[PDB]
Each structure stands twice: as C-alpha cells, then as structure tokens.
Amino acid sequence: ELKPTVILKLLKENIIQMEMIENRTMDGKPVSLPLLYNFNPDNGFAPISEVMEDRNQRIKEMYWKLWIDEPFNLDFDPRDVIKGKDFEITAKEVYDFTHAVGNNCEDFVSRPDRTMLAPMDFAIVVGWRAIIKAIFPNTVDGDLLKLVHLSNGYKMIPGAKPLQVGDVVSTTAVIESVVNQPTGKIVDVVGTLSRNGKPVMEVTSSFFYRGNYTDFENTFQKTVEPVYQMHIKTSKDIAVLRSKEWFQLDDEDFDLLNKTLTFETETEVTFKNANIFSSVKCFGPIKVELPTKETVEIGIVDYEAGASHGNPVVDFLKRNGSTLEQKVNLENPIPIAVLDSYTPSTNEPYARVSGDLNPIHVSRHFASYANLPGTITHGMFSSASVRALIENWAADSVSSRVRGYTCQFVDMVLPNTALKTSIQHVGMINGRKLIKFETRNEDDVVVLTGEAEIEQPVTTFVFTGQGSQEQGMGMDLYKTSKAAQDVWNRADNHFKDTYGFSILDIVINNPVNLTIHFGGEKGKRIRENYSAMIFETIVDGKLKTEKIFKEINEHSTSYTFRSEKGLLSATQFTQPALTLMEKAAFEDLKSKGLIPADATFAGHSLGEYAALASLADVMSIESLVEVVFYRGMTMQVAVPRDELGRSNYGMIAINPGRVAASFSQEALQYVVERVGKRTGWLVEIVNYNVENQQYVAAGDLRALDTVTNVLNFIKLQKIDIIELQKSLSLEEVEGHLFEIIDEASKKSAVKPRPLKLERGFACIPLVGISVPFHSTYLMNGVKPFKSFLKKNIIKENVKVARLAGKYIPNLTAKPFQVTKEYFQDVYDLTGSEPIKEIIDNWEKYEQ
Amino acid sequence: MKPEVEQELAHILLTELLAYQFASPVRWIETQDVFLKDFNTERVVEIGPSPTLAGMAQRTLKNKYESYDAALSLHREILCYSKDAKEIYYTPDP
Numbered sequence: 001e002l003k004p005t006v007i008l009k010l011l012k013e014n015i016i017q018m019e020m021i022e023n024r025t026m027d028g029k030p031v032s033l034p035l036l037y038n039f040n041p042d043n044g045f046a047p048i049s050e051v052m053e054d055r056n057q058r059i060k061e062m063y064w065k066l067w068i069d070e071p072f073n074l075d076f077d078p079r080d081v082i083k084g085k086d087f088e089i090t091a092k093e094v095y096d097f098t099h100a101v102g103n104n105c106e107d108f109v110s111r112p113d114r115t116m117l118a119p120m121d122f123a124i125v126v127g128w129r130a131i132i133k134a135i136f137p138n139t140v141d142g143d144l145l146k147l148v149h150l151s152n153g154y155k156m157i158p159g160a161k162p163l164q165v166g167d168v169v170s171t172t173a174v175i176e177s178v179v180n181q182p183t184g185k186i187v188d189v190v191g192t193l194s195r196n197g198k199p200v201m202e203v204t205s206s207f208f209y210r211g212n213y214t215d216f217e218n219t220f221q222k223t224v225e226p227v228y229q230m231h232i233k234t235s236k237d238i239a240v241l242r243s244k245e246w247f248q249l250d251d252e253d254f255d256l257l258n259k260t261l262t263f264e265t266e267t268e269v270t271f272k273n274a275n276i277f278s279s280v281k282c283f284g285p286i287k288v289e290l291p292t293k294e295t296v297e298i299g300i301v302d303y304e305a306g307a308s309h310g311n312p313v314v315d316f317l318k319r320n321g322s323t324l325e326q327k328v329n330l331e332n333p334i335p336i337a338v339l340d341s342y343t344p345s346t347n348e349p350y351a352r353v354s355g356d357l358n359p360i361h362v363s364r365h366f367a368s369y370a371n372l373p374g375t376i377t378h379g380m381f382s383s384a385s386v387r388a389l390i391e392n393w394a395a396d397s398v399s400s401r402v403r404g405y406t407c408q409f410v411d412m413v414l415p416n417t418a419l420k421t422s423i424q425h426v427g428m429i430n431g432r433k434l435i436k437f438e439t440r441n442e443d444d445v446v447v448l449t450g451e452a453e454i455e456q457p458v459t460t461f462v463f464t465g466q467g468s469q470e471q472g473m474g475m476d477l478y479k480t481s482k483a484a485q486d487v488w489n490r491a492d493n494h495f496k497d498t499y500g501f502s503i504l505d506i507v508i509n510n511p512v513n514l515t516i517h518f519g520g521e522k523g524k525r526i527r528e529n530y531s532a533m534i535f536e537t538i539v540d541g542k543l544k545t546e547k548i549f550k551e552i553n554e555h556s557t558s559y560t561f562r563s564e565k566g567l568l569s570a571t572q573f574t575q576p577a578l579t580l581m582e583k584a585a586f587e588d589l590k591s592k593g594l595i596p597a598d599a600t601f602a603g604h605s606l607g608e609y610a611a612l613a614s615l616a617d618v619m620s621i622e623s624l625v626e627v628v629f630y631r632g633m634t635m636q637v638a639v640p641r642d643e644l645g646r647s648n649y650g651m652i653a654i655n656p657g658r659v660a661a662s663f664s665q666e667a668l669q670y671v672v673e674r675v676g677k678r679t680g681w682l683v684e685i686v687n688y689n690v691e692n693q694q695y696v697a698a699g700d701l702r703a704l705d706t707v708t709n710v711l712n713f714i715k716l717q718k719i720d721i722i723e724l725q726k727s728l729s730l731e732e733v734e735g736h737l738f739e740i741i742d743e744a745s746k747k748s749a750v751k752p753r754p755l756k757l758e759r760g761f762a763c764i765p766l767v768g769i770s771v772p773f774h775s776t777y778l779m780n781g782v783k784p785f786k787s788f789l790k791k792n793i794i795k796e797n798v799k800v801a802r803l804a805g806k807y808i809p810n811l812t813a814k815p816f817q818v819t820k821e822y823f824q825d826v827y828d829l830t831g832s833e834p835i836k837e838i839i840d841n842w843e844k845y846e847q
Numbered sequence: 848m849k850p851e852v853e854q855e856l857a858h859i860l861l862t863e864l865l866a867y868q869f870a871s872p873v874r875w876i877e878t879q880d881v882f883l884k885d886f887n888t889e890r891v892v893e894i895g896p897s898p899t900l901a902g903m904a905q906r907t908l909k910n911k912y913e914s915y916d917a918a919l920s921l922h923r924e925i926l927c928y929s930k931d932a933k934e935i936y937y938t939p940d941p
Contacts, residue, residue, distance in 0.1 A: 292850040330937055396922075425937065457924070460888040462904065464895030465873075473896045582894045585928050594935065600882050604900060605873055609865065614894075618861065631869065688876045690906045773869045786866035793865075795858035803857060809864045813877030815885075818853050818860065826860065830867040834859055845852050 003030070005365050014039050016048070020366060022359040024348060026069065033062040056143050060136055063144050066357045067132050074138040078178065079220065084130025084171035084191075089118045091165050093353065097122050100350040101381060103388040107399035117399045118163035119391075120154045120201060121384040125354050127191035127203045130173040134189040135207050139218040140178060142185060142209030145360070145370045149379045150186070151450075153204035153406035158597075160200045162399050163193075170194040176204070177221035180274055184210040204406070216278075221269035225282070225314055228263050228321030232256045240320070246313055247286070249299035260289035263321065265301050267311050280305045282313040291796035325430035328593050336423035336435065337393045341385050343377045343417045350381045372412065379409040382448055386421055386439055390452045393423055394435050403432065404453030411447040418442060431456050431596035459599040461615065463582050463607025469574045471510045471566065474581030483591035484584035487621055491580050494622045499629065500526035503580065506573045510566035516559045527552060530559065533630060535637050538780045545784065548633050569768065575606055575632040576625055582610040583621065600815075602808035605774065606631075616802040623792040630788050638771045638781055646754045647770035648701045649682075649777075652708065652763035656692050659715045659762045665692055667721045671714075671737065672697055675706050678741040679748075683707060686774035697763075698772030701755055702748045708760040709744035710737075715761050879907045883923075884915065890924045892935060898927035 003023050011017040016037040023030040035058070036051040043049075057074065064072040069085075094116060098108045107117040124131075134140075135147070156162060163169065173191035191203040232238060238256050241247050265284040272278040282303040287295035303313045347361045356378060359366035367375050387405050395401035413419065419439050427434035432453050439448035477484040492504045500516040500523070518527040533548035552559055567573050589595055595615075603611030606628070613624045639647040656663045669685060676683040676699070683699030683706075697707060714721075725733040748755075757765035772778070800818055807816035812825055820842045827835040838845065882888045883904070893900040905925050908916070916923060926935055933939055 290850075292854050294850040332938070334937060334939065457889045458886065459890040459892060460882040460886065462891065462893050462900040464893060464897065464900055467895060467899055468897045470896060578896070581896065585894050589935070592936070594937075600886050600888060602878050602882060604875060605868065607895070608868060610894075612861065612865070627865075635869065685872055687873045689873075690879070690903055691876045691910060693906055693910070694903065774872050776870070778870045779867075782866050782870050785869075786862065789862045789866055793858065793862055795855055798854060798858045798861065800853055800857045803861065807861070808878050808881060809868065810873045810875065810878070811864050811868050811871045813874035813881065815881060816857075816861070818848065818857050823856075823860065826863065829871055830863065832863055832867070835863060838856060838859065845856060846848065 005363065007032075011036065015051075020359075020363075020369065022066075022363050022366065024351065024357055024359075024362055025066065026355075026357065031062055031065050034058065056141055057138075059144050063132075063358075064136070066359075067129065067355065068136075069129065074136055076137055078134065078137045078139055078175050078218075079222070081172055081174045082130045082133050084127065084133070084173065086168055086170045087126040089122065089126075089163055089165055089167045089169065091116055094118050094122065094165055097125065097353045100353050101384040101388060103384070103391075105388065105391060105397065105399060116165035118165060118167065119384070119388075119399070120156065120162055120402065120405065121387055123154060123163060123169075123193055123201060123203055124152065124380055124383075126169050127171050127173060127193065128355055130171050131189050131191045131203065131205050134173055134175050135187055135209075139215075140175075140185075140187060140209075141215070141218075142211065142213070145366070146184075146210045148208040148210060149409055150206040150208050151204075151406060151408040152206075152380065152383055154201060154404070155204065155453075156201045156403040157199050160198070162402075163195070163200065167195050169200070173203075174222070175220075177223060177269075178219055179221065180213045180216060180219050180271070181208070182274065184208055185213040216271045216273060219271040221267065221271075223267040223269075225263075225265040225267055225284075225311075225317075226323055228265070228317035229324060230261045230263075230317070230321045232259050232261065237320075244316065246282070246301050246303035247299065248302050249286070251298065254288075254298050256288075262287040262289070262295060263301060263313075263317050265313055265317065267314060269311075272307070275309075277308045277310075278306070280308040280311060282311050293799050293801070326593070327427050327429040327434060328591070329427040330425065333436075334425040336425055337389075337421075339389050339393070339421045339423070341389065341419045341421060341439075343382070343385075343413055343415055343419065345415050347375065347378050347381060347415065350378050350384075354378070354380055356380055374414050376412040377415055377417070379412075382409065382413055382419075382439070383407045386437060386448060386450070387452070389421060390423065390435065390437060390454075394425070394433065394452065394454050396457070398457075401455040401457065402452065403455055405450070406452075407448060407450035409447070410449055411441070411445055413441060413447050419447065421448070426451075428593035429453060430593055431599070432593075456594075456596045459596050461586075461599060461601040461603075461611060463601075463603030463611040463614065464578070465603070465605035465607050466571075466574060466578065469568050469578060471568060472508050473577065474584055475508060477581075477584055477588055481584070481588045481591075483587040487580065487584045487587050490621050491576075491625050494625055497522075498526070498529055498622075498626065503573070503576060503625075506567055507577050510568040512563055512566060514561045514567055516561075518557060518559075527554075527556065533633060534784050535634050536780050536784055537638075537640075543780060546637075548637055571636050572629060572632040576628045579606060579610045579624065579628045582607060583613060583624065586610070586614040598806075600806050600808065602810075605810060608810055612807065615806060616799065618798050618803075619793050620797070627789060627792050631785070634781055634785055635771050635773050635778075638773070638778055641770075642754070644754070648753050649699065649770060649772045650701050650704055650757050651686065651696050651698045651766040651769045651772070652704050652757070652760075653766055654695045654697055654707075654711070655762045656695065659711050660718075660720060662720045662722065664722065665695065668695060670721060671710060672707065674734070674737050675703060675710060675741050675744075678738050679703055679706055679745045681706070682772065682775065682777055684772070684775045684777075686772065696766065698769075698775045699777070701753070701757060702745075704757060704763075704765075705748040705751070705755055706741060706744040708758060708763050709748060710740055711762050712760045713740055713744065875903070876907070879904065880911075883907060883912055887919070887921065888923075889921050891926065893927040893929075895927065896929050898930050901925050901927040901930070 007019045017034050019032050019034045021030050021032045025031050038049045040047050061072050094108050176188035176190050178187045187207040189205045193200045268281045270278045284301050285297045286299040288298045351357050360370045361378050391402050421439040423437050425435045436451045441447050478488050492502050495503050530549050530552050534545050536543050536545050563570050601611045601615040612618050641647050656668050681700035681703035683703035686698040687696030803816045805815050823839055891904045
C-alpha cells in the first residue's frame with residue numbers, strides 16, 4: 001500500500017521541515033524525524049543551511065522509539081553499567097529467528113523428548129536493547145545515521161551451556177573503550193548475559209561514529225586484561241619482580257621461588273589526546289598457585305601513573321608472562337569449504353524478530369539520505385547466516401561446539417546478492433579448533449572476515465597395554481617433534497643417572513646384552529638404587545620380602561641384562577619404552593593444542609600409568625620411568641623360573657563366540673571357575689577385552705591346557721552349559737562339567753611342567769607371557785609396589801579436577817570420584833586397610 | 848571437603864588403584880560401556896604402535912551400540928595414532 005514517507009513544508013518564515021516518516025516501528029504508529037534547514041534568501045549560491053544544533057539529539061530520540069522501550073533520556077553516564085530488561089527465550093521466537101536467518105540446525109527445532117536450544121545469534125537480539133543503549137548517551141555525541149557496525153563477537157564463557165528455550169536471561173552491557181580515532185570515534189560495547197544468576201556468554205560489538213570528535217574528556221578505555229602466568233624458577237626473576245613498585249605483595253617476605261603467579265589485572269586509561277594518556281591505573285589482585293591448585297591472593301598490582309604512553313604492567317606480563325592458553329596454527333591452513341549463501345530481497349523479517357528496526361536497511365529515502373547505495377542488508381543477518389554455515393560444516397550440525405565467533409563487516413551488502421564464503425581451519429587453542437572465514441560479493445570484494453573458536457568433539461583417550469614392541473618404536477616422532485625430544489631426553493638422562501643405562505640405545509638398536517658397570521661414585525649410587533628394589537612372595541604360606549638382583553651385593557662391580565633375541569622384548573625395557581612412546585606422542589598432541597580440556601582418558605593396564613601422567617601430570621617423567629621399570633622387574637621376578645628362565649604360567653586369547661553362537665561370558669566364567677576349583681591349579685579371567693568376543697585367562701600353564709581341552713571337547717559335542725542348568729536339570733551341569741574337567745586334567749597332568757601351550761578352536765596362547773598379572777596370584781606383590789608408588793607419587797603433584805569424572809581405572813571399571821561409595825567399591829574389589837581408615841573416619845574428612 | 852584433604856584422599860586412592868591394578872582383572876567392557884554410553888564420546892583416539900584398542904572399540908560399537916547410536920543420531924570417529932595420524936593432526940594430502 002502507498003504510505004506517506006516524507007513531508008516537505010515550511011515550519012516558519014525561514015525554516016524548512018523535511019520530516020522523514022518511517023512506518024516499520026515497534027507499536028505500528030509511524031515515527032517522524034523532523035530534520036530542519038535555515039532558508040536564507042540573501043545567500044544566492046547556497047540559500048539552504050542545515051540546523052546542526054540539537055540535530056544529533058533529535059536523530060537519537062527517533063532511534064530511541066525505534067529500539068528502546070523506555071522513556072527517552074540521554075543524560076546518563078556511559079561509564080555506568082547498563083542493565084537491559086530480562087527476556088524469556090520462547091519456542092516461537094526461536095522458530096521465527098531461525099526462519100528469518102535460514103538456520104537449518106535440529107538443536108533449534110521442536111523435537112520429541114529433547115530441549116530446544118537457542119542460537120548464540122539470538123543473544124544479540126536480547127542484548128541489543130542494552131548494547132545499542134551504550135551508544136545513545138550525550139557524552140557519546142554522534143549522528144546515528146553514520147553508525148558503522150565494524151565487528152560483532154560472541155564468546156561463550158567456559159563451563160556454561162548455550163541458551164535453551166524457556167531460559168530467562170538477565171542482560172547487562174558496559175562500554176569497553178570510547179576513543180577519538182582520526183577518522184571518527186570507535187565505541188566498543190561488551191554485553192554480558194546472566195541466566196539463573198550465573199554468567200553464560202559475553203557478546204562484544206564495535207561501533208564507529210564517522211566524523212571529527214575532539215572531546216577527549218568523554219574518551220576512556222575500561223579494559224580487563226587477560227590473566228598472565230609467571231613460573232618463578234630463578235632468583236633474577238624475583239629481583240626483577242621486587243624492582244616493580246606496582247608489584248605490591250601483601251607479605252613483603254613471601255618466598256616466590258618455584259611458584260606460579262597469575263595476575264588478574266585490568267587497565268583503566270583516560271586520554272589527553274589520541275596518542276598520549278592523561279591517567280593510567282592498572283590494578284588487580286596477584287594470585288599464587290598452591291600444590292592444591294586453589295590460587296590464593298598474596299598481593300595486588302597497584303600501578304597509578306599520569307602522562308603515560310602505554311601500560312608497563314601489560315608490556316611486562318606480555319614478554320615475561322604466558323597468556324595461559326597459547327594458540328598455535330596448523331602446518332597448512334585446511335580449506336574446510338567454499339559455500340555460496342544468498343541475501344533475501346527484503347530484510348524486514350529479520351528486523352522484526354531482531355528488534356533492529358533501522359530504517360536504512362528497509363526504507364529507500366533514509367538510505368538515500370545516509371549516502372548508502374540502497375537498503376543495505378543487516379550486517380547482523382550476514383553474521384548469523386555465515387555462523388549457521390560455520391555451525392553446519394565445522395561444528396558438524398552441533399550447537400554447543402560453537403563457543404567463540406567474531407565477524408568484521410569489511411563492506412556493505414545490497415539485497416539480492418549471491419555471496420561466496422571461504423572457510424579455513426588455521427589454528428588450535430588448548431584443544432579447540434580456530435577457523436577463519438572470508439566472504440566476498442560477486443565482484444570478489446571482501447565484505448565479511450572473521451574467526452570462529454569451535455569445541456573439538458568430545459574425546460576419549462585409550463593408551464595400549466603390552467603389545468608389539470617393534471625395534472626403534474617412537475623414533476619417527478623423536479627425529480621431528482621437539483615436545484617428544486624433551487620427554488625422550490629427560491627419560492634417557494634419568495636412566496643414565498639412576499640405572500646406569502640409556503633407553504634410547506635399547507629402543508634404537510635393541511642390544512642382545514647390556515652390562516651396567518658400577519664404576520666410580522656414580523657407580524655406587526647406581527648399585528644403591530639396584531639394591532633397594534625388593535619383591536614379596538608366598539612360599540609355604542609365608543610372605544618373604546626377597547631382594548631383586550640377588551647377584552648385586554655391596555662388592556658387585558657389574559650387572560648383565562641377558563636376552564636371546566633383543567632386550568627390547570624383555571618386560572623391564574618393553575614397558576618403559578612403550579609407555580615413553582605413548583607419553584612422547586601425547587606431549588606432541590598437547591604442544592600443538594589438540595587435547596580438549598574436558599576429554600576422558602583410560603589406559604589398558606600399563607597404558608593406564610602413561611594416561612595418568614598424560615592428562616593429569618600426577619607423576620614426573622622421572623617418577624613414571626622408575627614406576628614402570630620397577631613394575632616390569634616385579635612382574636619378571638613374581639614366578640619361580642628354572643635354569644632356562646621358563647615358568648609354569650601363561651595366558652590364552654579366548655573367543656567365546658567361536659566355541660558356540662550361544663556361549664556367553666557367564667557360560668565362560670562358570671567353566672573357568674569350575675576348572676580352577678576341581679584341578680585346584682590357579683586360573684582366572686584377567687582380561688575382559690570385548691563382550692562375547694575377546695577374553696584372556698591367565699594362571700597355571702596346565703590349568704590353561706585343561707581350559708583349551710574342555711572348550712575343544714564342548715565345541716565338538718555341541719552342548720550349551722546355560723540351557724541344561726536352567727530348563728533340563730538343577731546343579732547337574734556342575735558335576736557333569738567336573739567329569740569333563742577330570743578327563744581334560746588327567747591328559748594335562750601327564751605332559752611335563754614346561755608344556756608347550758597348544759592353540760585350540762577359540763583360544764590362542766599369548767607367546768612371551770610367563771606371569772599371571774591381573775590375577776589374584778600377585779596380591780602378595782602389591783605392598784612393595786605400594787611402598788614404591790607412595791615414595792614416587794608425592795600427594796602435592798595430584799589434582800582432582802583432572803581426574804574426577806575423567807580418569808577411568810581398570811581395577812573398578814568406574815570413573816574416578818572422591819566419595820565414600822567409590823572407596824567402598826575399591827575396598828570390595830581390593831581389601832586394603834588405608835581404605836577402611838578413610839571409610840570409618842569419613843565424617844571427620846568432611847570438615 | 849577442603850582442597851588439601853580431598854587431594855590427600857585422591858592421592859591415596861590412585862596409589863591403591865595403581866598398586867592393585869596388576870592384581871585385578873582389566874574390566875574393559877565395563878569401561879567401553881562407560882565412555883561409549885555414559886560419556887557418549889564420538890571420538891575414540893588410540894595412542895600406541897598397533898590398532899588393538901581402536902580394533903577393540905569398533906567391535907563393541909558394531910555389537911551393542913548400533914541401536915543406541917541410531918536412536919541418538921551421533922557419528923563416532925575411531926582412530927589409532929600409528930595408523931590414522933593424519934586425521935588426528937589435521938594434516939591431509941591434496
């Protein structure tokens with residue numbers, strides 16, 4: 001329909017009133033903007049002079065009734081925090097916002113038995129009324145027609161969930177910094193979102209009033225600085241910190257050596273001119289890390305300066321302090337996608353939902369007065385359209401994965417424009433994926449730039465146990481990687497200075513023999529370490545604490561490690577080698593920032609020890625190497641060998657799905673327990689690998705020869721244990737299996753004690769294994785191991801927040817928690833006395 | 848629970864967990880039925896010299912987690928560090 005948009009007329013004898021009436025308002029009553037001119041007929045050339053007095057105040061007053069839903073008042077202080085009225089996120093408004101922007105994410109659709117999320121796009125809507133309010137005051141004096149939105153950034157506060165449907169949001173916003181640039185006046189506005197009291201996310205915006213602004217008294221910069229860590233290792237760093245008068249410790253004689261100092265600083269700057277600062281006052285509490293990681297205030301930055309040209313504090317903490325999460329780029333920036341979006345013919349449907357009723361985007365006449373090439377499409381729409389493609393292609397159709405998103409509006413886009421975005425994954429930041437995008441119009445002219453910080457998908461680490469120890473494993477990384485080199489060097493040096501050999505030698509060339517020589521004052525130290533290693537064994541129902549290396553006394557000049565093929569295949573060099581290769585690999589991923597902060601980790605037996613030191617850094621690499629070497633030696637000395645070094649134990653890789661298609665793991669556990677009872681020879685299930693597919697049963701070498709014979713016989717006879725015990729006869733399968741265990745055990749008790757373990761139809765004999773570890777048999781071997789662990793793992797180096805819900809032991813098969821229920825579960829599985837002290841005295845450790 | 852007392856109890860717990868771990872069976876099925884279901888983990892990275900754990904984790908998902916993943920509509924990536932190193936480091940060939 002044909003509505004009146006302009007009314008040109010006379011207001012007085014000399015005054016003209018070109019009154020631009022826009023119709024798309026909040027209520028529906030069209031809002032009139034009366035811009036004036038002073039018609040002077042005595043100026044024949046230019047008889048029109050535009051009224052400048054009150055011009056910006058009128059323009060603002062119109063835009064108030066367009067955006068703000070309050071009484072018009074500009075005599076408020078910009079410094080003061082602005083608190084926008086709370087807004088409920090409704091399913092209908094999430095439908096209409098997602099329809100306007102063309103966002104096709106399932107998370108924002110009404111689904112069965114599912115919460116509808118709200119896009120972080122939607123946040124700019126709720127904020128808008130507070131954020132825009134920032135640019136209104138009388139001390140931010142500018143024409144709003146010449147408002148350039150430079151950039152807009154969303155940053156999801158760590159440990160928050162993205163916005164859900166029905167979430168009541170309490171919105172604040174404050175001006176970061178209003179600066180008089182040469183080209184105009186940049187206003188940076190940060191809007192916090194507070195749901196349920198707790199902060200969820202911080203929208204950032206950058207508004208650039210174009211023109212000339214000399215009012216530097218109005219200019220300020222209220223920046224909060226990023227936290228900066230300093231590991232104080234050497235006494236020059238202390239002397240430097242004590243020279244810093246600003247660095248005001250609460251206690252003067254606080255020892256700072258071998259600590260970690262965080263500086264939660266903020267920068268306040270007030271200007272004299274565009275280049276110099278009138279007054280700078282950087283202050284904020286100086287925290288120190290405790291061995292508990294709970295940081296304690298021990299002082300304050302209280303820098304107070306006048307005619308400054310910078311922040312010395314920020315400069316100081318920048319070079320001498322790390323930004324916690326360092327960003328590192330990829331080797332080649334991966335081109336993710338090259339997509340082709342499309343701007344709609346009109347922007348009205350987005351303006352209505354976003355409350356962004358700026359005429360210039362919709363009205364032709366305002367756009368003409370604003371010197372624009374037409375009804376320029378909403379930057380916010382271009383921001384939301386690209387982010388929906390970044391959420392589709394990089395986040396992979398997930399909402400929570402998108403955290404950070406900053407977009408700069410390089411050039412304006414006109415309606416009916418086929419844009420072309422280029423998505424590029426360039427870096428990683430503490431596990432997160434940093435993607436840069438550049439969108440171009442049909443002329444290839446840059447219109448959008450920006451970078452989206454995306455959560456890497458939820459990850460679980462599994463560290464392999466004792467598998468294939470191929471010669472020179474992990475050397476490929478050790479040549480290239482520096483993070484791997486550091487680990488390998490420290491380990492190598494520690495073995496040279498503790499056990500008088502080099503792991504690097506043993507991995508690289510795998511010598512058949514290696515002789516430790518205890519020659520000199522270093523030699524004595526090596527022989528003390530090799531002496532102190534002990535192990536406990538049950539002999540005639542008697543726990544004897546025997547000594548590892550019986551042929552190492554006070555007067556032993558050398559020891560010899562002797563293998564047949566290579567010492568790498570020996571457990572005492574297999575276990576550290578493999579654990580170090582895994583630790584070196586993980587340290588390479590962690591240097592390049594490919595480890596998510598919340599990921600789960602759970603290693604398979606030996607791998608577990610790596611995995612603990614990997615994610616949690618509980619033990620030092622000098623502690624890890626000792627505890628994996630000692631473990632390898634204790635395992636090696638557990639069994640009573642002959643002169644050939646051969647034992648009467650071993651393992652088999654049983655497949656319950658081969659013997660039959662009805663043979664479950666409850667059918668296997670019955671057959672193994674009955675075999676163990678009847679013959680009396682030790683046999684247990686030590687590995688539950690994969691359900692009804694992979695198990696490993698250790699124990700006596702004859703008892704695994706009975707198990708192979710029993711599951712060869714039952715496979716041929718085609719009988720099921722579970723069918724006959726339930727629906728045929730009660731307790732008859734017990735005695736009927738004893739006669740099959742007795743006909744296997746007679747033929748298994750006639751071959752000698754170094755009996756070659758023979759492969760059956762379901763089982764495979766795990767060659768090189770001579771000890772039943774993960775069996776009841778090694779309970780006796782735990783107390784010396786436990787004494788060694790408590791010596792090596794100092795309680796000051798353990799942290800709970802890197803274990804609680806993340807570490808999954810193989811003892812329990814339950815995620816690590818510090819509770820009375822889990823402690824009960826650990827005791828039940830392993831009946832120790834220090835777990836009975838903690839369970840009993842639990843009600844004292846609660847305070 | 849104070850930070851220092853909790854730290855002591857955690858330190859004593861992990862010590863006793865590592866001390867007895869080689870004296871208890873490796874209940875990995877009741878861990879593969881924790882991080883694949885309870886954590887709903889969609890990326891299983893194996894660090895090692897052979898894809899045993901990634902070849903151990905693709906069998907559990909085939910067996911009992913076809914119906915569970917088809918009812919939630921997630922995609923699970925299974926990777927080994929020895930074999931699938933490129934899709935871990937994000938270093939593909941043109």
